[PDB]
Structure formats: structure tokens, C-alpha cells
Amino acid sequence: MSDAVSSDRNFPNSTNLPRNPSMADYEARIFTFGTWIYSVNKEQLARAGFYALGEGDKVKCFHCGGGLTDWKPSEDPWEQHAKWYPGCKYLLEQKGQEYINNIHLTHSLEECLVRTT
Numbered sequence: 001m002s003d004a005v006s007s008d009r010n011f012p013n014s015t016n017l018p019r020n021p022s023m024a025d026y027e028a029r030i031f032t033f034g035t036w037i038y039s040v041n042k043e044q045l046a047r048a049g050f051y052a053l054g055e056g057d058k059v060k061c062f063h064c065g066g067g068l069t070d071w072k073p074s075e076d077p078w079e080q081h082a083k084w085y086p087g088c089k090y091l092l093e094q095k096g097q098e099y100i101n102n103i104h105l106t107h108s109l110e111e112c113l114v115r116t117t
């Protein structure tokens with residue numbers, strides 16, 4: 001009888017809120033990165049599974065590990081992390097192992113644009 005302790009009922013105690021993305025996720029993550037920028041909105045980068053450690057740029061992956069630093073102009077987090085170390089929970093779960101595997105094998109994205117501009 002695996003009772004576990006996660007999915008049962010709401011209101012854990014009082015402080016533990018449901019989630020509130022635009023309160024402790026979007027602004028929280030970004031707040032750790034800073035107004036500074038490089039490619040896309042730091043929030044997008046964080047959504048994939050990234051979080052700054054106070055210092056600008058220096059950001060590490062969640063759970064899967066692997067610290068990323070010195071990003072490259074115009075780059076997505078999904079493909080980036082997936083290549084360096086494809087082992088994220090939400091990432092793999094999102095588009096399944098099939099999608100993650102596809103990335104780590106051949107070039108993807110940046111296609112179907114009339115005629116490469």
C-alpha cells in the first residue's frame with residue numbers, strides 16, 4: 001500500500017502555496033539572473049530547467065546537474081542542455097525520451113522558413 005506523500009489534498013500547511021508561476025518562478029528565476037541578457041529572456045532559460053546562483057551568467061541545471069556558463073548568442077535551453085547532458089526530469093517528461101534522443105543525434109529546429117531567408 002504505497003501511500004506516499006505528494007498527491008492527496010491541497011493546503012499542505014499554510015505557507016506552502018500551490019505554485020504561483022508569476023510570483024516565485026518567472027520573477028524569481030529572472031531575479032537571480034538579472035536585467036542583463038545574452039540570447040533570450042532568462043525566464044525562458046529558467047523554464048527549461050535553469051537557475052542563477054546570484055552571480056550573473058553563472059547558472060546551473062536543476063536535478064540533472066551540469067553547470068552552464070558563458071552562453072552563446074541566439075541559443076535555446078532545450079537543445080543546449082539536451083546535448084551537454086540529457087537527463088532533466090521536466091525536460092525529458094515534456095516531449096518524452098523520443099524528442100530528447102532526436103536532439104542528441106542530428107541537427108533540429110531552424111527549418112521551414114520559405115528559403116533560409
Ligand SMILES: CN[C@@H](C)C(=O)N[C@H](C(=O)N1CCC[C@H]1C(=O)N[C@@H]1CCCc2ccccc21)C(C)(C)C
Pocket residue numbers: 058059060066067068069070071072
Ligand atoms: C557555447 N555553449 C556554451 C553554453 C558552453 O558550452 N560553454 C562552456 C561551459 O560553460 N562549460 C563547458 C563544459 C562545462 C561548462 C563549464 O565550464 N562550467 C563551469 C565549470 C566550473 C563550475 C561552474 C559552476 C556553475 C556554472 C558553470 C561552471 C565553455 C564556454 C566553458 C566552453
Ligand SMILES: [Zn+2]
Pocket residue numbers: 049061062064065081085087088
Ligand atoms: Zn538539465
